[PDB]
Amino acid sequence: SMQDTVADMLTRVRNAQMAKKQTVSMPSSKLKVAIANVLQQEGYISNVEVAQEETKSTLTITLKYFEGKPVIEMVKRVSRPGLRQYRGKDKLPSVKQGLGIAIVSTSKGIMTDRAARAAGIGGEVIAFVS
Amino acid sequence: MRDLLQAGAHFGHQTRFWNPKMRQYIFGARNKIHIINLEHTVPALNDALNFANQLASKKNKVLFVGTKRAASNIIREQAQRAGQPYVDHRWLGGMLTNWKTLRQSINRLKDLQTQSQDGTFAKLTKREALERTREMEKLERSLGGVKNMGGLPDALFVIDVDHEAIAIKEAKNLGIPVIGIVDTNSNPDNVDYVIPGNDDAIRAVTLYASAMADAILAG
RNA sequence: AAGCGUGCGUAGGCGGCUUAUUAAGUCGGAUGUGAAAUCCCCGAGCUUAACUUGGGAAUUGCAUUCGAUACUGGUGAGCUAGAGUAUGGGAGAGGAUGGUAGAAUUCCAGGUGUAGCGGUGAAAUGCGUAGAGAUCUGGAGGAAUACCGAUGGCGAAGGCAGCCAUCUGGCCUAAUACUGACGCUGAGGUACGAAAGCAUGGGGAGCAAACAGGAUUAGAUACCCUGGUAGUCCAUGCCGUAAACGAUGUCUACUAGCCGUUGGGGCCGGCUUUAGUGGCGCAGCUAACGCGAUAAGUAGACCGCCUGGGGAGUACGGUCGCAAGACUAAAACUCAAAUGAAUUGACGG
Ligand SMILES: [Mg+2]
Ligand SMILES: [Mg+2]
Ligand SMILES: [Mg+2]
Ligand SMILES: [Mg+2]
Ligand SMILES: [Mg+2]
Ligand SMILES: [Mg+2]
Ligand SMILES: [Mg+2]
Ligand SMILES: [Mg+2]
Ligand SMILES: [Mg+2]
Ligand SMILES: [Mg+2]
Ligand SMILES: [Mg+2]
Ligand SMILES: [Mg+2]
Ligand SMILES: [Mg+2]
Ligand SMILES: [Mg+2]
Ligand SMILES: [Mg+2]
Ligand SMILES: [Mg+2]
Ligand SMILES: [Mg+2]
Ligand SMILES: [Mg+2]
Ligand SMILES: [Mg+2]
Ligand SMILES: [Mg+2]
Numbered sequence: 001s002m003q004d005t006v007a008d009m010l011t012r013v014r015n016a017q018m019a020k021k022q023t024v025s026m027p028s029s030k031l032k033v034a035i036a037n038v039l040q041q042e043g044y045i046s047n048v049e050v051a052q053e054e055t056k057s058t059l060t061i062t063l064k065y066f067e068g069k070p071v072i073e074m075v076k077r078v079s080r081p082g083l084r085q086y087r088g089k090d091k092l093p094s095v096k097q098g099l100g101i102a103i104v105s106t107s108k109g110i111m112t113d114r115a116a117r118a119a120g121i122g123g124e125v126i127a128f129v130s
Numbered sequence: 131m132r133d134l135l136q137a138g139a140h141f142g143h144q145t146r147f148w149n150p151k152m153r154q155y156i157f158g159a160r161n162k163i164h165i166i167n168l169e170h171t172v173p174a175l176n177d178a179l180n181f182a183n184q185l186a187s188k189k190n191k192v193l194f195v196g197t198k199r200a201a202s203n204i205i206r207e208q209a210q211r212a213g214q215p216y217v218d219h220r221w222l223g224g225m226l227t228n229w230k231t232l233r234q235s236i237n238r239l240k241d242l243q244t245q246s247q248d249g250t251f252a253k254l255t256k257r258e259a260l261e262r263t264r265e266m267e268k269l270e271r272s273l274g275g276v277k278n279m280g281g282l283p284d285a286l287f288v289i290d291v292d293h294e295a296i297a298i299k300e301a302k303n304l305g306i307p308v309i310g311i312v313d314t315n316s317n318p319d320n321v322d323y324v325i326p327g328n329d330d331a332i333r334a335v336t337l338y339a340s341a342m343a344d345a346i347l348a349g
Numbered sequence: 350a351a352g353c354g355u356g357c358g359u360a361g362g363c364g365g366c367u368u369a370u371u372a373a374g375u376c377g378g379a380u381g382u383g384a385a386a387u388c389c390c391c392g393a394g395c396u397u398a399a400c401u402u403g404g405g406a407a408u409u410g411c412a413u414u415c416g417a418u419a420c421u422g423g424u425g426a427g428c429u430a431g432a433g434u435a436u437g438g439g440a441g442a443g444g445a446u447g448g449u450a451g452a453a454u455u456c457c458a459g460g461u462g463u464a465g466c467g468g469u470g471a472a473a474u475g476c477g478u479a480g481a482g483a484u485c486u487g488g489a490g491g492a493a494u495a496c497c498g499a500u501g502g503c504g505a506a507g508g509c510a511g512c513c514a515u516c517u518g519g520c521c522u523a524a525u526a527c528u529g530a531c532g533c534u535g536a537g538g539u540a541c542g543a544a545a546g547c548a549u550g551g552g553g554a555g556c557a558a559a560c561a562g563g564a565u566u567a568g569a570u571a572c573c574c575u576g577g578u579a580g581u582c583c584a585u586g587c588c589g590u591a592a593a594c595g596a597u598g599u600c601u602a603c604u605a606g607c608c609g610u611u612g613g614g615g616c617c618g619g620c621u622u623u624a625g626u627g628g629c630g631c632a633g634c635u636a637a638c639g640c641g642a643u644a645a646g647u648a649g650a651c652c653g654c655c656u657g658g659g660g661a662g663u664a665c666g667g668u669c670g671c672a673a674g675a676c677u678a679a680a681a682c683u684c685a686a687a688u689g690a691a692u693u694g695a696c697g698g
Binding site (some may be wrong): 001002003004005007008010011012013014016017019020021024026027028029030031034037038050055056057077079081082084086087088089104105106107108109110111121122123124126 | 363376417421429430431454534601606632647648651
């Protein structure tokens with residue numbers, strides 16, 4: 001059934017970028033919003049919205065395209081439910097030699113790889129984005 | 131704005147042969163036929179006409195290529211009255227890619243037409259010249275609109291981006307700029323200036339051609 | 350080369366959303382320890398180099414202790430998008446049991462009637478003057494259900510077709526209500542699983558392995574013809590295999606369109622929406638062929654399986670079986686290929 005939801009969101013965004021959609025909606029969640037805010041701060045998406053219907057929330061992402069091709073060229077789930085990643089502050093991965101980002105979950109929140117390296121911590125690697 | 135409204139640039143092909151890549155440039159579909167919205171269609175026809183005018187003002191050419199067997203008369207009509215190269219019968223695969231080879235036929239026509247009523251060809255048989263006249267007619271009905279071109283055109287104007295796909299691919303290869311009047315049943319794949327509107331109507335094709343020509347006359 | 354024949358489920362793996370808490374995983378610090386040598390880096394002595402040697406770095410570990418709580422886990426509390434339940438309808442060769450119908454074949458008795466029938470490429474074997482074949486009447490019996498009939502339907506798969514009753518399974522579909530993550534997948538294990546075969550007892554019309562005869566043929570243990578027994582059918586059990594195939598494991602989400610068809614819902618013959626089942630085709634994917642919302646695309650969860658060809662799915666051991674066999678499953682030896690898809694020719698009874 002549906003078990004990984006972070007990967008399901010990443011897959012929705014990837015597939016909507018492949019089909020030149022301008023917006024992608026999905027069922028919202030606290031962690032999904034926390035990852036969408038990081039994708040927006042790094043300039044990878046345009047806008048993030050969360051609409052409460054009555055009890056089920058819906059997240060809506062606005063996508064960016066730069067000269068035809070999409071901005072998110074590659075997005076990859078790294079820590080699956082079947083295998084979690086858990087890097088340390090020294091082994092934090094770099095994506096495309098620092099031209100891409102790595103979403104990390106640390107006890108200080110969800111951040112990018114270089115933010116966690118600056119803060120001298122690092123926990124679960126969620127996704128590579130470029 | 132309203133001149134294309136009374137022209138039938140709105141009505142199009144039936145709502146079963148649409149290309150899904152034109153759903154932005156459509157408005158609705160009444161009576162089982164998609165109707166193009168002319169509002170945002172005019173704002174791009176004007177840009178295409180400005181591009182054609184500024185291209186004719188910097189001393190460049192533009193090939194009018196239309197051969198759908200319906201607007202093949204109006205294309206020659208509104209082009210030869212505008213001093214520009216024409217394509218009326220067949221898109222002649224390899225006109226731009228193998229332009230050097232077709233030069234060897236444009237020169238055969240520049241020699242054959244001059245060998246009919248320009249060099250006073252006399253002292254010959256009446257039936258022997260019929261074969262050479264057939265050669266010249268077969269060559270002219272195919273290339274008589276590109277004789278005064280002499281080089282690769284700088285722009286192109288097509289009446290059916292769908293029916294003239296070989297020409298659009300040759301342009302997208304040779305790095306030329308294309309302009310097309312793309313209807314509902316057509317792909318806007320490599321048209322540099324897409325102009326949504328009818329590609330088969332009499333008055334609409336005549337309007338597109340006459341407007342392009344009147345923009346060419348800005349010289 | 351490689352998806353178990355198909356399900357169900359045990360251990361296990363993995364699991365929706367919100368919130369409080371914890372701090373096990375995870376992260377950070379500190380403190381012990383992680384022998385020296387070796388490796389690495391600076392530099393020091395051998396005329397240089399090997400070599401010797403000072404100091405570090407490293408030893409990514411483990412333990413203790415303190416801190417951080419995003420994520421995973423635990424615990425409490427909630428929620429309703431997954432899963433399920435109740436209530437009205439609908440389609441259906443779903444299954445099991447028992448009746449019944451009509452056509453036809455075969456055989457039997459009688460009537461008419463007389464010389465062929467039958468069969469083939471051509472024949473012959475064969476059946477006929479004891480009366481065949483043809484035709485009519487009556488009867489007996491077994492097996493299968495023309496037309497409808499349909500890339501139709503139902504079923505987990507194997508499969509399922511006249512009609513009727515009885516017992517029974519699932520699915521679809523509309524509303525309202527309810528429960529509140531009750532889920533997905535599953536090694537072992539179990540259930541079902543074509544045909545052929547096997548056991549016990551029946552039945553036996555047609556067809557027909559084996560077999561017999563006639564042909565053909567160089568031969569003909571065949572193909573063709575005339576017969577024909579097991580078997581095919583029923584009851585009750587075994588067997589457990591198939592090109593058991595979509596050669597495509599199950600579940601979930603997402604990604605242009607167009608054209609059919611089956612079962613429903615909605616709205617005005619048409620439009621839409623669902624559950625199936627088909628034909629194309631964008632993107633993407635692919636060695637290519639192709640696939641393309643019924644993916645072989647994009648991702649995730651669990652499982653099964655592959656690792657050159659042969660020897661070999663064989664031996665030996667074991668489990669199961671009445672047996673036939675099935676299942677699990679090697680090695681020596683041997684070869685430098687075997688293979689897929691496409692291309693250009695040539696050939697084709
Ligand atoms: Mg194979
Ligand atoms: Mg299978
Ligand atoms: Mg369990
Ligand atoms: Mg668990
Ligand atoms: Mg801890
Ligand atoms: Mg040491
Ligand atoms: Mg709970
Ligand atoms: Mg019956
Ligand atoms: Mg409740
Ligand atoms: Mg299961
Ligand atoms: Mg098993
Ligand atoms: Mg026989
Ligand atoms: Mg098998
Ligand atoms: Mg198989
Ligand atoms: Mg359908
Ligand atoms: Mg329907
Ligand atoms: Mg297809
Ligand atoms: Mg798939
Ligand atoms: Mg493949
Ligand atoms: Mg064996």
